[PDB]
Structures are given as structure tokens and as C-alpha cells.
Design a protein around this ligand. Structure first.
Ligand SMILES: *[C@@H]1O[C@H](CO)[C@@H](O[C@@H]2O[C@H](CO)[C@@H](O[C@@H]3O[C@H](CO)[C@@H](O)[C@H](O)[C@@H]3O)[C@H](O)[C@H]2NC(C)=O)[C@H](O)[C@H]1NC(C)=O
Ligand SMILES: Nc1ncnc2c1ncn2[C@@H]1O[C@H](COP(=O)(O)OP(=O)(O)O)[C@@H](O)[C@H]1O
Ligand SMILES: *[C@@H]1O[C@H](CO)[C@@H](O)[C@H](O)[C@H]1NC(C)=O
Ligand SMILES: *[C@@H]1O[C@H](CO)[C@@H](O)[C@H](O)[C@H]1NC(C)=O
Ligand code: ALF
Lengths: 869, 328
């Protein structure tokens, strides 16, 4: 059914129920000043097409489901407050002109026999009844066609993100996506951005290069294609002959099982039908590291439900795997327990050093020589993993296996027991060292980080990864430079404490998520609750003033938490470009969610707002799509409130000259079509095509982004400027014809000096004034923008003659009453000589102040646009 | 995800366009050519308007010493006011006969709606069923008022007459024509009489006159082409003005056959049948005689305006040059 769609379309929105409350207000003939046409017809369009723009989605879902078998905008918040501001101002004037009309019905109304008719009516009671008339007559102060237009502007601006050929990857065939067509203007207002650093700032193309065993470094040129066995299919040009011959003969035990661990402790989908022994790993590390083992002979053949046929130098030895200690983002590691054919049970473990160093043996010779190795690897962007093992007596496996069987039964819930069983045995393990594998920055990332930084978008990198790979990658993508002063977290505790007892070009800092929450500290309760909150908000202020901060070693649970903090305790607008299942959390939190396709699952992609393939595509999303979207959006608002305030307020001025009685200064139908037909197209096209500069020049000058972030181009004051400039304009549209109507304006046998011709002249000078105003606003005059403006004015005049033709009069004499008014008001040279005057008086001061403001205070676009280069 | 986005100018945001930039060389001249066309047109409007010969006469008689103050309280209903005026310069071409009403708000919200326009259109159903819009003047006692509405009810019903007092002192009446005061559209399109019939009497059955009118709408004019709802004065009246102080074309004075001026300079007398009370609400009544100008009528506001804005366009234009030169 389609009725439920409109039911919630009205209640949630502030204004959609407003005009519904008004429609009953105009329903009763007691206060029927403006007909229900004035609001019903524009209300159907704003609610009609708005449902069509969303009904397509529901229709698509129904089809896909049958044959097979919340983020809110800053601009949205302001508009709701503006409609409230129109509500108070409208009712303030509805009562502010009730005092003026209260007198008029006593002094002039009582004696005015042409108005009195013989029904007892108090001067203040007549003021009460009109108080509904003032509300009704000036109803269109609240823009009826706003919420429809906002959705269309965003939907169009979202499809440019999808359609961009320069945000479309080549080999992956992964165009950009705009999953949430609801926050486009925010892309131009982004203050903060967040990243994962794997699949975000890297390619996920991991090729084994180095490793550490027993504290020795392997992978350096010393003492070389792999042609000695069938398993080592040549695809990895290696060096360091010592490692090559170390496995041929004289194999050490630790070196031997080392490559074995890579080929067992993993979760790949091994293949044997092809005969080449391929690998398809869900995680980039396992796939590449396992491939390293096969190149060194330790090839993994196949795996069954409880057995694995791993091979070593052709010695196919089958292990019986009984349990698997899977890897989830929270635990940051993996382990496996297998039974060797001899009879023993062997435990292997791998993963990050932090969550594995917490469980080191009491003392190992390979402890320090390992610790000083990983940093050396990570110093040049190596994804180093610690690999360690342990052998447990059979008695240790006895008690450890029942609790699996208790946890093995699925039932309704099985999530907590598996957590405790993994930890307790794993607390002790025997280490070898750590591997190392390079994932190079994807091309264009240094440009976008540099370009967006000059656009004053603060960029943060959030990653549970090495505090070194991202820190070294940061300089490799211009995230950090010589000027910034990255410092360790020890000073933050002292400095942040130091300011606390006091209360009781870029800056950056390097910290760890394992330590991040220590700062947040994750009668005493109330004092301590505010104790950490003061540290919380203060620290976010130590972070908000930064365009590069290294927040790392943070789990999925700690991804969204950081995005919560700045989103809430700063009100700043947050985008997030993410990756994998581990970041689906924060991408929901941020105002804009972005997820890179990557090679670690379509999880962040499916839980985001705008998704594409490479971080370098973030350039055109913000500097071209977000930036234009904001300028296209909030230039639409300035013209959209203007065109309505300058529209109704003729009712205000004409009220002074009709007994404050709230008479319509326009035709009955000029109020309906004004918001949907006479000023809707040109402002919409400006909202989809208005390029202050070219796309190439938009990227060449990232400084144009300052407008959206600072919100200069629209504020609360600029809303009233669109009112006052609409008050001034409404006077000019009214009084210039008034002065020309007080005297003769060409009075002859055809003497137009009546109210209808007064209305037509005001209407004619209105559309031209505003449709030239939008023409004076469009910086990018496309042949469709020009068509929209002149077509709009031609459209106004085109159907006005139809509305004023004799043919339509017989159709609805009581509703289409203006007849021959334009044909008798637009043929007078005086009237056009007045419309030209009113239009000139409306626009020449505007052109003068636009030029004068552009001269004394040239805009950033203006200075850039004066040049042809 | 999907295939390549097809490369088009529209989708790639590189449509052909002109980038109008408001340099000095493009804003400065548009100001002057405005200032060099608003001045000469302003001079054209102003001089022609001042070349239009016009005389205005206030005959309400509210102030003392006017020789029709008796008409403020017409103890006997028909009260006649006589005013003598002299024309210093003759009128050339046809002359328009007016009336005015100051401080008379014909544009009140309640007032304007008070009209069954469908019934003014001769809708057979609308005669006997006046709309709620003209609620207070729907019916007099039992049957509905055909010209319903406050406005149609409150019709200006004076009779301004012009007499030329020659050298012999014998008044010579001045011809005044009652046709062609309203628009062509209003006569035939907006305002229509009921359908059928031949005589306006049998056509307006079951309907009383408005309370204020002295006589029914049957014979508002002797000519059958100007009686009923197509009455010229009615259409001019009912076609509500935009302001309280407004003016309405009352009659025509076409050019005489002889070469002499239509209204030669001399002494003239205005004999008006006072029938419209405007002193209750501080209102006035006037009569204006105006000669045609080929370029509209006497509109000093437009003429003074074009001089005013035309100069300011030049003053704005000449202001802008200094800033441009200083910041070159
Ligand atoms: C010209 O128009 C004026 C309107 O200003 C007419 O005066 C109005 O005349 C009607 C009656 O014809 C008055 O209505 C009522 O009349 C009865 C007597 O019939 C009287 O008892 C009521 O008290 C009430 O007055 C109406 O009041 C009066 N206008 C005003 C402001 O008092 C005039 O009759 C018209 N004359 C011609 C020749 O068209
Ligand atoms: N499949 C994996 N198995 C074991 N350890 C891993 C794995 N992937 C990464 N690691 C190690 O644990 C840390 C977590 O990597 P993480 O950023 O959470 O994964 P990703 O970014 O690819 O979704 C890393 O520092 C790494 O040392
Ligand atoms: C106006 O003219 C008439 C007739 O000529 C005369 O009786 C009357 O006194 C004159 N009034 C004035 C004020 O000149
Ligand atoms: C003025 O007009 C009336 C009405 O026709 C007429 O009776 C009268 O004689 C005229 N002259 C006056 C009042 O001097
Ligand atoms: F790139 Al990550 F957790 F480090 F998704």
C-alpha cells in the first residue's frame, strides 16, 4: 500500500504537518482567505514526487525479494529551526498586524458604511478572526516545496559521485557509490575524515618480502628465481640465498616449523583441481604469507573437516586438526591446535605483537632480538606479524576440550564461552620472531592527503595496526611533514593532568588504543564521572585542532567510539572512509560513511554512505562533489527563502493600503505555482550544475573548500538577509507600481489602474526579479541553466496568458478570475516602463552590491575566476 | 562493482558553458547605458506628463464656505452642488472624464471577496444561489439580491455634469459619452448578463436590488447594450481599485469635428448630483478633466523616477570608476 508512505512523511517533519494543520485552517469558510488550492496543490507535488523518489526503492526491494524465493544533516537541523522561525515571525506579524487592524475596525471600520453590514462585531473580535486570515494569507512564508527540492538536489548530486569517471577504478571495475543520497551538502562541510590504513591507504596486494626467525633478518641481498621443486611456482623474485639453501638441507627445527606455521595456522580455501595449488584467502595476510611457505617448499595441499594434508619438501604429512581458535577483529590474532601423526598435539599461534607479547613465555632468548626487529621492518611500511607455537601435554588438552564441547553445541547462543577458553591456555607460548610483508601505498594517496589538507579537511587515520606502519606510511602520503611535532603519549598524561589541577602548520601526536582508553578512564561517581569527561572533551580539543593524529591499536569497538566523541562533543561534521568488517561500526557513527572496496570483504562497503575503490578518489568527492554540492545546496536555500519572503511580503505591504485586512496582492493561482513552477526549475539546475570553477580548477585550488566548512555562504543571519532583502524587494515590487498606480499609468479607453493589473504588475516584476536574480547567481551558465531561467520566465508568461485567456475563464469563473489583465497590463508601455523600473530598481542595487562587495571583498572563487588560466 | 561510467559531459560535470564574470568592463557600461537611457526616457516621460493639461475639483463640500455644505445632511434626498472653475489653457484632443474617492478602501479583504463573480458571469444557478462570499447581501427579505456583494451594493451614484458658461452667460452643455470607459475584455468576457431572453426585466426574475441602490439593475442605462451587469460604470466601479485613494474613468469627451479645442480656455461650471456620503469616514470626492497624451497619461512619478534612478545609475556608474582605478 502507498497510503502508509505519506503517513510518516508528514508527522516526523516539522513543516509537512504545518501545511496539514493549515489546510484545515483554510477549510472552514469562516476564515477562508486563501483557498485550499493555494496549499493543497503545492502540497501534493512536494509530497507526491518525494514519495516517487523513494517509491522506486521499495518497488525494487519487492521484486528482488520475490523471484529470489539514523543519519541527519546539519542543514536539515537548520531548516527545521527556520520553519519555527517563520512560525514565530508569521504569528508575530499575524498578531503584530492584529493590533493595527484592531484599531482600523473601530475608527474607520465602524463609520465606513461600505464595510459595516449589521452584525455585532467587536473591534478586537474582528482582530481575532483576521488573526487566522493573517496566518492563512501569509502561509507561503514557510516554503512548501523545500523538502522536495532538498531531496532532489541531494539525489542528483549523489549520482555525480557514482558517475564520476575519475573516481572509477580500472582493473577492479569498481565505480564510486553514493549509498545514502541524503547528506551530499555535508560532503562540502566535512571537518574530519577517518581511515583504516589497510585497504584504505594501501592496495591489499601483499607479497612476502622479509621475515625474522630466531632474531635473524632474512630477505637481504647476500651470498634468484625458485626452480628446485614443483611446489615453488615461480612468482616471487627473492634474494638472500642463505635462506634459500637453509631449507634445502641442514634444516634447523625452528626454521623448519617456521614456514610450516605459515602453511597451517590460517583459514585459506586451498585448491587442487587446477593442479597449480592456488590459494584463496579471505584475509590478505594469510593468503600472502601462506604463499611464501609454498615458495619455500612448505606447501599446503588440502584440508578436511578435521584433517589437513600439509606437505613439506614432498613429504606429505597429514595432521588431524581438532579445534580452531578463529580470528576475530576484537582478539587480533589466530591460533590452531593439531595432532601430529606421531601422536603429539601441537599448538601454533600468529598475529600482532601487542596481543601476543602479553602472552610471552617467562623468558625466551628470542625476546629482545625480536622486539628490535619488528620496528626495523615496520620502519619502511612492513606489516609484521608475530608467529609463535607451544606443545602441551595430553593432560592439558583433557580439561581444555570439554569446555569446547559445552561451547560447541550451537543452541540459541554461543558467543561468551569461546572467549574465555581461548585465553587461558594461550597465556604461555614459545616465540620465533615475526614475519614482514609490504603493502605499498596505492597511487594518488599522497596527492589527495596533500590536496585535502590544503582544503582544510582534518584527516585522521584510525587503525588497530602497527603504530609504525601507519606512522611511516603517513610521511609516505604527506599526512605528516617536518613541521609537525609528533610526540609519544607520556607527555600527554602529564600535560593533560597539568591543565586539570589548574582547572581544579599542523600538530600531531602518536598514541596507542591500548593506551587511548587509559586517558578516557574506561559522591565519588559523580565527581569521577565529570573527572574523565573533562579529560574527554579537553583531549578531543587537543585532537580537534589537528589535521593528522595517529590513533591506533583501536578495535572495532573503539573505532565508532572515537567518531562518537568528536561528532558529539564538538558538533563537527564527520566523514569516515573505511574498510573491512572491523570498521562497519564507525562508518555508521560518522555523519558521512565511506568504505573502500578493498580486498577484505564488502562489509564496510555495505555499511556506508558513499563507497568507492581508492582513497585518491576522495579528492573529487569533497573538492569537486562535496564542495559544489554545498555551494549548489546553500545557494539554493538563499534564493529559496528569498523568493518566498519577497513573494508573500507584498501581502504585508498591501495590507497597509486595504484596511490591514490581509488581502491577496496576487492572483489566486500565482501562489500555487510560484513554489513549484515559476522558481523551482532554475534554482534546481543551479543546485546541480553551478560550478564556481571548473572541475580541473576545483582540484587545482583546494582553498575553495573553506566556504563549506566555515559555513560562510549561509548562516542564521543570511536567512534574515534573504528576508530583509525580501522585505526591500517586496516594497519595490509593491510601491513602485503603487506610485505608478496612484497617478495614471496610461489611463485611456483601456485604463489599467485596478487591483488585478496591480497584482499582475507585481507578479510580473516578481518572476523577472527573481529569475534574473538566479541568473545573477549562476556562475556556470550552461545552455540548460540559461534555458531554465529564460524558460522559467517564458513559462511564467506563457501560462499566465492561458490563465488570463478568455478560454480558461469559462472553465472556472469563480477560481480563474484574472482575465485579460496581463494582455491589458503588459501592452501598456507605462506598465512595462514600470516593470523595467521595478525590475531595474530590484536588480541594479543588487548588481551594484554584488559588484561592490565583489570589489571591496572579492570572494575566493571571484579572485580565482577573474583569470582565464 | 559495476561497469565503467559512460563518459558524457553531463555526467562528468564538464558541460560547455559561459562563465560571466562581473569585471569593470562589463558592469560599468551597463550602468551608464542605463544612466544614458533612463535620463532621456525620464526626460521624455516628465516633459510629456507636464505637457498634459489637467484640472482637479473637490466637490465633497465637507469644509465650510463651500456652497454645497447643505448636502452633508440631505434633509431632502436629491441635493445638488454647483462649482465654478476656469480653464487657463485649452485641451487638445479627446478629454477624459473622471471621478475619485479618497480614503475609500475598496480593496478590503472582506470587501473584495463580497462578489459572486460566477453570478456576474451570468451563471443561471448563481443568480438564485449567491455564493457565501457575498453573505451579508445575499437576499433583501426573501429572494436573493442579484448584484450581490458589498461592492456592487455600494456603487458610486453621483452625476457629474460639465457646463460651459459662454460670454452670454447662458450655460452650454458639454457632450459626455458613456461608452468605452471600461476595457474591451471586461465588457464581453468577465462581466455578462444572464442567458436567454430578450428583455432584462424577465431575465432578472426572483431577485431584488441591493439595499443601497435606489433602482433595480434592470434599466441602469437606457441603451440595452449598457444595462444589466455589462453597465459601463458598474464594470469600472466593481473592478476594484488597488488603493484607498483611487481614480476611475467616468466618461469620454471625443474630439469635436471643428478645429477648435475640445475644451477652450474660459469659465466652466460643475453641477453635480450629490448622492455619495464620504464624510462619515473622512472621505472625499473629486472630478478630474485630463487630455490624452500619445505616450500614456500624466505620470510624474514615473517621469521623476526615471530621472531619479537614471541619475543614480549614472552616479553609481561614475562612483565605480574611482574604485576600479584605485584598485587596478
Ligand atoms: C446612492 O448610494 C447611497 C449609498 O451611499 C444610497 O444611500 C443608502 O440608501 C439606502 C436605502 O436606499 C440606505 O439603506 C437603508 O435605508 C432605509 C430606508 O429605506 C433606512 O431606514 C436604513 O436605516 C438604511 O439607511 C443606506 O443607509 C444609505 N446609505 C447610507 C450610508 O446611509 C442612496 O440611496 C443611493 N441613491 C441613489 C439615487 O442611487
Ligand atoms: N588474519 C590475521 N590473522 C592474524 N593476525 C592478523 C591478521 N590480520 C592482521 N593481523 C595482525 O593483528 C593486527 C590486526 O590487523 P587489522 O587491522 O585488525 O586487520 P584488517 O585491517 O586487515 O581488517 C595486526 O597488527 C596484525 O599484526
Ligand atoms: C457660480 O456660478 C453661479 C452661476 O454663474 C453663481 O450663481 C454663483 O454665485 C457662482 N459662485 C461662485 C462662488 O463664484
Ligand atoms: C443641476 O442638475 C439638476 C439635475 O438635472 C437640475 O435640476 C438643475 O437645474 C441643474 N442646475 C443647477 C442645480 O443649478
Ligand atoms: F585497515 Al584495518 F583494521 F587496520 F581495517
Amino acid at each position: 500500500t502507498f497510503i502508509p508512505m505519506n503517513l510518516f512523511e508528514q508527522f516526523k517533519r516539522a513543516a509537512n504537518l504545518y501545511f496539514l494543520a493549515l489546510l484545515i485552517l483554510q477549510a472552514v469558510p469562516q476564515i477562508s482567505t486563501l483557498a485550499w488550492y493555494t496549499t493543497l496543490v503545492p502540497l501534493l507535488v512536494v509530497l507526491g514526487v518525494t514519495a516517487i523518489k523513494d517509491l522506486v526503492d521499495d518497488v525494487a526491494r519487492h521484486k528482488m525479494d520475490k523471484e529470489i524465493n539514523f543519519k541527519r544533516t546539519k542543514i536539515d537541523y537548520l531548516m527545521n529551526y527556520m520553519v519555527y522561525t517563520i512560525f514565530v515571525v508569521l504569528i508575530l506579524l499575524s498578531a503584530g498586524l492584529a493590533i493595527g487592524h484592531a484599531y482600523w475596525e473601530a475608527q474607520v471600520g465602524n463609520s465606513s458604511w461600505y464595510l459595516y453590514d449589521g452584525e455585532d462585531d467587536t473591534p478586537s473580535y474582528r482582530g481575532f478572526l483576521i488573526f487566522w486570515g493573517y496566518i492563512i494569507v501569509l502561509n507561503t512564508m514557510v516554503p512548501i516545496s523545500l523538502y522536495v527540492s532538498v531531496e532532489v538536489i541531494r539525489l542528483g548530486q549523489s549520482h555525480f559521485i557514482n558517475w564520476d569517471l575519475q573516481m572509477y577504478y580500472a582493473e577492479k571495475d569498481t565505480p564510486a557509490k553514493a549509498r545514502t543520497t541524503t547528506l551530499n551538502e555535508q560532503l562540502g562541510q566535512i571537518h574530519y575524515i577517518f581511515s583504516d590504513k589497510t585497504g584504505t591507504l594501501t592496495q591489499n596486494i601483499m607479497t612476502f618480502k622479509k621475515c625474522c626467525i630466531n632474531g635473524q633478518i632474512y630477505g637481504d641481498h647476500r651470498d634468484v628465481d625458485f626452480s628446485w621443486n614443483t611446489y615453488a611456482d615461480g612468482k616471487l623474485a627473492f634474494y638472500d640465498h642463505y635462506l634459500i639453501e637453509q631449507i634445502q638441507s641442514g634444516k634447523e627445527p625452528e626454521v623448519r616449523q617456521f614456514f610450516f606455521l605459515l602453511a597451517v595456522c590460517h583459514t585459506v580455501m586451498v585448491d587442487r583441481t587446477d593442479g597449480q595449488l592456488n590459494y584463496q584467502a579471505a584475509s590478505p595476510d594469510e593468503g600472502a604469507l601462506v604463499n611464501a611457505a609454498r615458495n619455500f617448499g612448505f606447501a599446503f595441499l588440502a584440508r578436511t573437516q578435521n584433517t589437513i594434508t600439509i606437505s613439506e619438501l614432498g613429504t606429505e604429512r597429514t595432521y588431524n586438526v581438532l579445534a580452531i581458535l578463529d580470528f576475530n577483529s576484537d582478539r587480533k590474532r589466530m591460533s590452531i591446535i593439531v595432532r601430529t601423526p606421531e601422536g603429539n598435539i601441537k599448538l601454533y599461534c600468529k598475529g600482532a605483537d601487542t596481543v601476543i607479547y602479553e602472552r610471552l613465555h617467562r623468558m625466551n632468548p628470542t625476546k629482545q632480538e625480536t622486539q628490535d626487529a619488528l620496528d626495523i621492518f615496520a620502519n619502511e611500511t612492513l606489516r609484521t606479524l608475530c608467529l609463535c607455537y607451544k606443545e602441551i601435554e595430553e593432560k592439558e588438552f583433557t580439561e581444555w576440550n570439554k569446555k569446547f564441547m559445552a561451547a560447541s553445541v550451537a543452541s540459541t547462543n554461543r558467543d561468551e564461552a569461546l572467549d574465555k577458553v581461548y585465553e587461558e591456555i594461550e597465556k604461555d607460548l614459545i616465540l620465533l620472531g615475526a614475519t614482514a610483508i609490504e603493502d605499498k601505498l596505492q597511487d594518488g594517496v599522497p596527492e589527495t592527503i596533500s590536496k585535502l589538507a590544503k582544503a582544510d579537511i582534518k584527516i585522521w587515520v584510525l587503525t588497530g595496526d602497527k603504530k609504525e606502519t601507519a606512522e611511516n606510511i603517513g610521511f609516505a602520503c604527506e599526512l605528516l611533514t617536518e613541521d609537525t611535532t609528533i610526540c609519544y603519549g607520556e607527555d600527554i598524561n602529564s600535560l593533560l593532568h597539568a591543565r586539570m589541577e589548574n582547572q581544579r602548520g599542523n600538530r600531531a601526536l602518536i598514541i596507542t588504543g591500548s593506551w587511548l582508553n587509559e586517558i578516557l578512564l574506561e559522591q565519588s561517581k559523580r565527581r569521577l564521572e565529570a573527572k574523565k569527561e573533562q579529560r574527554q572533551k579537553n583531549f578531543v580539543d587537543l585532537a580537534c585542532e589537528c589535521s593528522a593524529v595517529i590513533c591506533c591499536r583501536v578495535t572495532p569497538k573503539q573505532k565508532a567510539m572515537v567518531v562518537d566523541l568528536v561528532k558529539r562533543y564538538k558538533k563537527a561534521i564527520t566523514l569516515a572512509i573505511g574498510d573491512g568488517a572491523n570498521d562497519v561500526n564507525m562508518i555508521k557513527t560518522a555523519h558521512i560513511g565511506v568504505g573502500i572496496s578493498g580486498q577484505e570483504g564488502m562489509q564496510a562497503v555495505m555499511s556506508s554512505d558513499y563507497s568507492f575503490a581508492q582513497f585518491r578518489y576522495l579528492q573529487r568527492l569533497l573538492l569537486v562533489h562535496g564542495r559544489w554540492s554545498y555551494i549548489r545546496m546553500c545557494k539554493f536555500l538563499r534564493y529559496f527563502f528569498y523568493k518566498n519572503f519577497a513573494f508573500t511580503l507584498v501581502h504585508f505591504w498591501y495590507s497597509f493600503f486595504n484596511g490591514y485586512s490581509a488581502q491577496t496582492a496576487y492572483e489566486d493561482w500565482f501562489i500555487t505555482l510560484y513554489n513549484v513552477l515559476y522558481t523551482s526549475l532554475p534554482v534546481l539546475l543551479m543546485g546541480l550544475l553551478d560550478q564556481d570553477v571548473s572541475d580541473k580548477l576545483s582540484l587545482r585550488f583546494p582553498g575553495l573548500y573553506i566556504v563549506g566548512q566555515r559555513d560562510l555562504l549561509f548562516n542564521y543571519k543570511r536567512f534574515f538577509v534573504s528576508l530583509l532583502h525580501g522585505v526591500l524587494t517586496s516594497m519595490i515590487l509593491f510601491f513602485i507600481p503603487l506610485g505608478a498606480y496612484l497617478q495614471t499609468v496610461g489611463q485611456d479607453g483601456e485604463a489599467p489602474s485596478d487591483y488585478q493589473s496591480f497584482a499582475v504588475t507585481i507578479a510580473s516584476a516578481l518572476v523577472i526579479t527573481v529569475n534574473f536574480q538566479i541568473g545573477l547567481d549562476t556562475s556556470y551558465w550552461t545552455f540548460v541553466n540559461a534555458f531554465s531561467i529564460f524558460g522559467s520566465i517564458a513559462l511564467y508568461f506563457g501560462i499566465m496568458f492561458d490563465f488570463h485567456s478568455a478560454g480558461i475563464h469559462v472553465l472556472f469563473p469563480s477560481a480563474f478570475q484574472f482575465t485579460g489583465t496581463a494582455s491589458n497590463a503588459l501592452r501598456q508601455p507605462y506598465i512595462w516602463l514600470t516593470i523595467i523600473l521595478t525590475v531595474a530598481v530590484c536588480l541594479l542595487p543588487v548588481v551594484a552590491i554584488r559588484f561592490l562587495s565583489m570589489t571591496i571583498w572579492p570572494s575566493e572563487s571571484d579572485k580565482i575566476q577573474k583569470h582565464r588560466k | 562493482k559495476t561497469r565503467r561510467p559512460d563518459n558524457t559531459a553531463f555526467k562528468q560535470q564538464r558541460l560547455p558553458a559561459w562563465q560571466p564574470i562581473l569585471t569593470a568592463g562589463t558592469v560599468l557600461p551597463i550602468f551608464f547605458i542605463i544612466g544614458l537611457i533612463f535620463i532621456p526616457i525620464g526626460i521624455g516621460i516628465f516633459v510629456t506628463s507636464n505637457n498634459i493639461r489637467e484640472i482637479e475639483i473637490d466637490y465633497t463640500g465637507t469644509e465650510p464656505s463651500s456652497p454645497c455644505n447643505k448636502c452633508l445632511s440631505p434633509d431632502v434626498t436629491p441635493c445638488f452642488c454647483t462649482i465654478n472653475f476656469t480653464l487657463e489653457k485649452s485641451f487638445e484632443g479627446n478629454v477624459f472624464m473622471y471621478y475619485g474617492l479618497s480614503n475609500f478602501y475598496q480593496n478590503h479583504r472582506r470587501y473584495v471577496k463580497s462578489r459572486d463573480d460566477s453570478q456576474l458571469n451570468g451563471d443561471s444557478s448563481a443568480l438564485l444561489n449567491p455564493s457565501k462570499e457575498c453573505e451579508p447581501y445575499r437576499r433583501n427579505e426573501d429572494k436573493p439580491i442579484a448584484p450581490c456583494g458589498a461592492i456592487a451594493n455600494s456603487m458610486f451614484n453621483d452625476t457629474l455634469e460639465l457646463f460651459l458658461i459662454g460670454n452670454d452667460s447662458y450655460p452650454i452643455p458639454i457632450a459626455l459619452k458613456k461608452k468605452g470607459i471600461a476595457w474591451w475584455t471586461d465588457k464581453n468576457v468577465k462581466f455578462r448578463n444572464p442567458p436567454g431572453g430578450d428583455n432584462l426585466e424577465e431575465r432578472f426574475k426572483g431577485t431584488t436590488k441591493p439595499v443601497n441602490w435606489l433602482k433595480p439593475v434592470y434599466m441602469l442605462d437606457s441603451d440595452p447594450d449598457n444595462n444589466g451587469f455589462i453597465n459601463e460604470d458598474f464594470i469600472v466601479w466593481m473592478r476594484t481599485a488597488a488603493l484607498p485613494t483611487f481614480r476611475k474613468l467616468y466618461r469620454l469627451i471625443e474630439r469635436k469635428s471643428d478645429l477648435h479645442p475640445t475644451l477652450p480656455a474660459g469659465r466652466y461650471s460643475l453641477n453635480v448630483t450629490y448622492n455619495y456620503p464620504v464624510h462619515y469616514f473622512d472621505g472625499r470626492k473629486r472630478m478630474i478633466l485630463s487630455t490624452i497624451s500619445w505616450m500614456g497619461g500624466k505620470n510624474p512619478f514615473l517621469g521623476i523616477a526615471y530621472i531619479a534612478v537614471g541619475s543614480i545609475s549614472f552616479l553609481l556608474g561614475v562612483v565605480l570608476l574611482v574604485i576600479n582605478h584605485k584598485y587596478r
